[PDB]
Amino acid sequence: FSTNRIYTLRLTRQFQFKINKQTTSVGNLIFNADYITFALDDFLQAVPNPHTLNFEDYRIKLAKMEMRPTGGHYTVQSDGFGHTAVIQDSRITRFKTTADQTQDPLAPFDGAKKWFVSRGFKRLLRPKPQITIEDLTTANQSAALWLNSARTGWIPLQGGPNSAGTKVRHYGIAFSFPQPEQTITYVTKLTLYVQFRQFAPNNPST
Amino acid sequence: FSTNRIYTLRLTRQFQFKINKQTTSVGNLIFNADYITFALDDFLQAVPNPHTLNFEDYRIKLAKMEMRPTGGHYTVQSDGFGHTAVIQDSRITRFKTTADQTQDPLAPFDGAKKWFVSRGFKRLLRPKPQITIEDLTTANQSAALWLNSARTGWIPLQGGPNSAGTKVRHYGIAFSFPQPEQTITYVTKLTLYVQFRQFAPNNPST
Amino acid sequence: FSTNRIYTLRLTRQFQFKINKQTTSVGNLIFNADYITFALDDFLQAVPNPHTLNFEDYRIKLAKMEMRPTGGHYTVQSDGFGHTAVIQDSRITRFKTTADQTQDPLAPFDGAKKWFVSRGFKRLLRPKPQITIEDLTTANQSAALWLNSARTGWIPLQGGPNSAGTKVRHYGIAFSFPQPEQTITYVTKLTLYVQFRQFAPNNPST
Amino acid sequence: FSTNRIYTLRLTRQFQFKINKQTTSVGNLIFNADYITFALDDFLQAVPNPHTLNFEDYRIKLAKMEMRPTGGHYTVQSDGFGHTAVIQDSRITRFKTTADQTQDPLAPFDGAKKWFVSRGFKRLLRPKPQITIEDLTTANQSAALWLNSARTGWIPLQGGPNSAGTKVRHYGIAFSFPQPEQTITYVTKLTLYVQFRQFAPNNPST
Amino acid sequence: FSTNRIYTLRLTRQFQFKINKQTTSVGNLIFNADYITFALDDFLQAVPNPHTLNFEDYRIKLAKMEMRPTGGHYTVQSDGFGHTAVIQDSRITRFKTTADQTQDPLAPFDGAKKWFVSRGFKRLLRPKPQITIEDLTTANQSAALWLNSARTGWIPLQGGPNSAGTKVRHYGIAFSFPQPEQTITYVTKLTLYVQFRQFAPNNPST
């Protein structure tokens, strides 16, 4: 029971996702995309999970996204295929498309993987937190760097001036789809595999 | 970082394809066919791809065509089977049929593979560029020759009197189908596996 | 062609540098110094280079500075010797001297290497990006940290709140010189050896 | 003494090259470039060489370019450095620059090699003839392909409708330079290492 | 971290040296000479160096003298050769000549190494501090002794009645030259390789 004692937990949450009936450029093949990021706090705030944890540090070793259709949609009713892509930096925010795309916006990525609209998909990834760099050739701008291995660093749950360690955004997975003729609803389940370091007391009473 | 340094990229593009409801020779079995060819420029002009590449030469090692039904078509709704065939010369243009065929026009080909209309198909091939021969027994006519191995040659991206190296047409895959009782729409994804030779600057400023 | 697929490119740019005739403390030995830093954007904006790259992340493995005399300067015309030094943090900005130095301001550095003014120099180094630390004993001040191995991290090209990943400043090489009796002009060539991670599409259309 | 009997010859020619005094943008670093291509006829027409050869076919295994200063220019008078690049397709014609370049136009090439203006350079290469492709996605345009190995093909000296086999253009080497303060004249020597197949008679008398 | 803990540093300083145009005994060969000694304080006083060191003892293991021409002097311009000699006692003071020598005053020394006036020289040596002997056959006179190995002793930085440990003079290197037809200026760089013993606090406050 040393300072560096480690514990591993599995954490999950779910939510609904909708792909809307195509009402634009009807008759043409169009694509759109959305994305998911992972933060420990997103999971601790889910109703059935522990809302606080008594550990000093954490690191996310692995994340999982599974999206499967519901609402009575037929798995044998083909609606083409889109792609999933692992995008481990804040550029992923551009891949929630705000206009219709004439090509699959994710297919060109290295690591892009096909998925069929009518079956959903399942994918695991190593999501990355973004370390700050403030020394750029343009003054007062900043950029990011992330570490190749999760074993390199630890994130204090209550470190920093806001005690907001659990809100670090880890990137990330995006998914694209050809727009279908009818609306399709899905159940999405996210899973975190998180290591925690150092069991810790509550903050002192004041 | 020598003159002969090689890089390899994967490139993709997508489009919609329709097989129309049978409205001719109704009640009888008929077949039609279409085809696809591959040019690097086709892929670089696709919206999400780089539209120019800073390499001196290229060669297409492998191509992949995948066509899958969309528009709510049921995979368990059987509409017979047609064939794909690898046709590596410009004769393939005759296999976009302009009249109904009473037999499957591609089935006799060596290499012809069956595919079910309601499931689509996936096929990889080695598409071939066509070298010119102008010395024929008939005057003012030319013919073609293609090389067995992609490693034999290189196509300069900006070589030739038109600087149109990326537009060389590589042949090719055709697909046939028995005409269905209802229209079927598909999503088609093409993929190229391309080697590039010699990282290169932009053309000099003028 | 996985998420972690790596590509390696060599990139270069050039510019002119002048060491001015000595017009101060005439007859005495004085020294001055200047310095160079490395940012990917510096090289992509150079006219003959690709101005955007379709990769998700990068890291600079190695940099090279070569400065050689031009303008008819005689290599056999001895004008003494100064030093180069590898300075891998923003302290290097103090070594663009604004006053004449009575000693060589770089010679004391560990790693300082001699170079003859009339011949120029060539030096390779591992330039370092600067990670931010904001938790200091003095309020409202920040400091830097850099990683020993380039393999530890990745810089996303479009990551961070400014999408300015390519503008991260990597430090750095400084060079000093005894002031010569006549002006000397040089041609400087910088070279980067950069690994890129994950071929990527263009940003979606908006 | 069979049909496939081979003979190897070394062939050479020389000419003068001038790099002009900079008279534009004086005070700025600018670059220009030129290039050389290789054709057997260029060498057979040189005064001291045999103007016809009694062989049926040939192939160029190796070419060499050596350019060295003359006109009294001092090798110890430094005028910076440019680069040489092997460019084995007709794109090389763009690298005879018609406007001043702000960067070295050849340095980014894979295989680019530095050379000092005041010493000249020497470089060997495998120059390539350009095979015609007329089947492009744009009608009535053509492009090129070249073969990786010289051992793959033979060029008949008198083949084709013009009996102009010796005029096939083999590409190619380009060289760039920073513009110097005074004009520099050079002697350039080119060398071909050519294999010939099948000793042959003169054409019949008519 | 014991009493005997050793640290090793490299220290350097520079200065100008002139060999004057021959204005005496013109038309004849004459020689003059000068010398350098080494004291830690000489290097700590130099502007860019730390002016105090927090160590208890030191010893100089190795010294280096490098003198190279400047002022535009041509290296290919022959001005004869002189010699360097390692003179490890205070007799060296006699070898700053005050009258012209008709022979090279240092060439006879065992260890004398020639150097060309137009190229300068570089020499390493083990400089020696001088231990006092006061028991001589003549009253009120003293002499010197020095130790063969640097490992034999240690010099406390603040030892002795003047706390002037860093001012111990270590001998020494002399250089001779034939008097040239025109003045020649040089840049001289001296380097010390110093071991320090026992990291130490500041002197107590008073």
Numbering used by the authors:
A (entry chain E), B (entry chain B), C (entry chain B), D (entry chain E), E (entry chain D): 42 to 247
Direct quotes from the study:
Here, we present three high-resolution X-ray crystallographic structures for distinct macromolecular assemblies of the capsid (Cap) protein from the beak and feather disease virus (BFDV), a circovirus infecting critically endangered parrots. These complexes include a 10 nm assembly, resolved at 2.0 Å and comprised of two face-to-face pentamers of the Cap molecules, and two 17 nm assemblies comprised of 60 Cap monomers in the absence and presence of ssDNA, determined to 2.5 and 2.3 Å resolution respectively in the same space group, arranged as 12 pentamers. Each Cap monomer was comprised of a canonical viral jelly roll built of two, four-stranded antiparallel β-sheets, with sheet one comprised of β-strands B, I, D, G, and the other sheet comprised of β-strands C, H, E, F.
The crystal structure of the second assembly identified in electron micrographs and infected tissue was resolved to 2.3 Å and comprised of sixty capsid molecules arranged as twelve pentamers. To determine the precise mechanism of DNA binding, we co-crystallized the BFDV-Cap protein in the presence of ssDNA labelled with AlexaFluor488 and AlexaFluor647. Crystals diffracting to 2.3 Å formed in the presence of labelled DNA were highly fluorescent, and displayed clear positive difference density corresponding to ssDNA. The capsid-DNA complex, modelled and refined to an R-factor/Free R-factor (R-work/Rfree) of 0.173 and 0.197, respectively, revealed an extensive array of electrostatic interactions with each ssDNA chain interacting with residues T49, R51, K102, L103, K105, K163, L165, Y234, Q236 of one Cap chain, K154, K155 of an adjacent chain within the pentamer, and F42, and R46 of an adjacent, inter-pentamer chain. That each ssDNA chain spans three Cap monomers, both within and across pentameric protomers is consistent with the increased stability observed in our assays. These DNA-binding residues are highly conserved in BFDV genomes. In total, 180 nucleotides are modelled on the interior surface of the capsid, and cryoEM data suggests that the remaining unmodelled ssDNA would occupy the interior of the virus capsid assembly, thus shielding the positively charged ARM domains. We found that in the presence of ssDNA, 60-mer particles were highly favoured with 10-mer complexes almost non-existent in electron micrographs. Once Cap is localized to the nucleus, the presence of the ssDNA viral genome favours the 60-mer assembly since the strong positively charged repulsive forces are neutralized by binding the ssDNA viral genome. Interestingly, the overall positive charge of the N-terminal Cap molecules in the 60-mer assembly (+1,960) is almost exactly equal to the ssDNA charge of the viral genome (∼2 kb ssDNA genome), creating a neutral and comparatively stable particle.
